[PDB]
Amino acid sequence: EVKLVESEGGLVQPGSSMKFSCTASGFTFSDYYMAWVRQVPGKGLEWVANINYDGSTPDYLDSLKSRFIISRDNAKNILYLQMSSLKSEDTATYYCARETVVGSFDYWGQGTTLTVSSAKTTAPSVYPLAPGSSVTLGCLVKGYFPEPVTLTWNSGSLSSGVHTFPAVLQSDLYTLSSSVTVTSSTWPSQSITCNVAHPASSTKVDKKIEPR
């Protein structure tokens, strides 16, 4: 299968520089135009740059032509994007894309998120939410930066009846909550634990929900 894997993103300081790579597999890399497209949630998709078969002719979004450089090595089958003097506006998920001969993108990478910000990484506080034929439990995840956090219940084995809500930004700290609903006769009998992972701070917190 055609496969595109972008390299590690994360949180970087304004004004810094960083180089993205995308490892291409499952097709003849030199037979296709390649491109970079980025997307900030709620604002849509924005084309950044593309490059010809042999790298001899790139094209850029002119507002970014001053700080971005697209490149490719068809011996290693990798596409690069070099970014300089990064601004907070460069915060987005960046996708590598295979460009068809006419100009569409028939394959996209998994995307990698870049956060350009001088706010400090802050681990989350995780608070339990404890209280018919069904019962609803929850976890409140407050005061973390940057996005994202990953919430699971019972290490992922409890997935039905879960609602994990979008995070809300408040004074450069994020908050979200997640609720899970189980049959009333199975709690507290069969334990229910929320797991909150925050890769940016290398932290994970597990809170088992118990009656008040």
């Binding site: 996209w108 404890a130 409140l140």
Partner: protein, 209 residues
């Protein structure tokens, strides 16, 4: 400089199994140099305005040329996806804003649950009261907080899920965040949900005692 692709409808109403058409208008002539994608990373659907890639099923139909383009989807089912148009007639390539389908289903009252602050949070000096309003339809809903019977508007933060891709409902979280000081000065904390499924609001409350 910029060709603008406008998808004016952020949401498009339909029902399970129906055919539906999504529209995309170019600010200049792009001929047939238009692509369509779906996205929860995007997946390519149609190129050259009307051509399907190998593996895209024929329930997708592209149409249009010049400035007016449409994507038609037959046998729509519950999903968590939007549809994006793109022009590649000239640099820079530009995308539409996206259109999400809304699936009709029977009206459903929310299940409302309220939770007091945890012992851990109070130790830190904060006090969040959380109210979940889960699995309701249609998406329009109102939540009101009351503290000792008095309506409270400051310190409330709401978050909404997208329409669930399996039961076609919506859910909402409402969190009232106070200081421990203010929280200890009052007794009754009430979350009130107003929904078209009833003329009387659903009231969940607790007393700090």
């Amino acid at each position: 400089g910029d060709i603008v692709m406008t998808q004016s409808q952020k949401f498009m109403s339909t029902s399970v199994g129906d055919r539906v058409s999504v529209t995309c208008k170019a600010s200049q002539n792009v001929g047939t140099n238009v692509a369509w994608y779906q996205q929860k990373s995007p997946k390519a659907l149609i190129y050259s305005a009307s051509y399907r890639y190998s593996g895209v099923p024929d329930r997708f139909t592209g149409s249009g040329s010049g400035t007016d383009f449409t994507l038609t989807i037959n046998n729509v089912q519950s999903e968590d996806l939007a549809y994006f148009c793109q022009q590649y007639n000239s640099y820079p390539y530009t995308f539409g804003g996206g259109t999400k389908l809304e699936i009709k289903r029977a009206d459903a009252a929310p299940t409302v649950s309220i939770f007091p602050p945890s012992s851990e949070q109070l130790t830190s000096g904060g006090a969040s009261v959380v109210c979940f309003l889960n699995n309701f339809y249609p998406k329009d809903i109102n939540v009101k907080w009351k503290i000792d019977g008095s309506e409270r508007q400051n310190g409330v933060l709401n978050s909404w899920t997208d329409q669930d891709s399996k039961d076609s409902t919506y859910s909402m979280s409402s969190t009232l965040t106070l200081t421990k000081d203010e929280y200890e000065r009052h007794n009754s904390y009430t979350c009130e949900a107003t929904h078209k499924t009833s003329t009387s609001p659903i009231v969940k409350s607790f007393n700090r005692n």
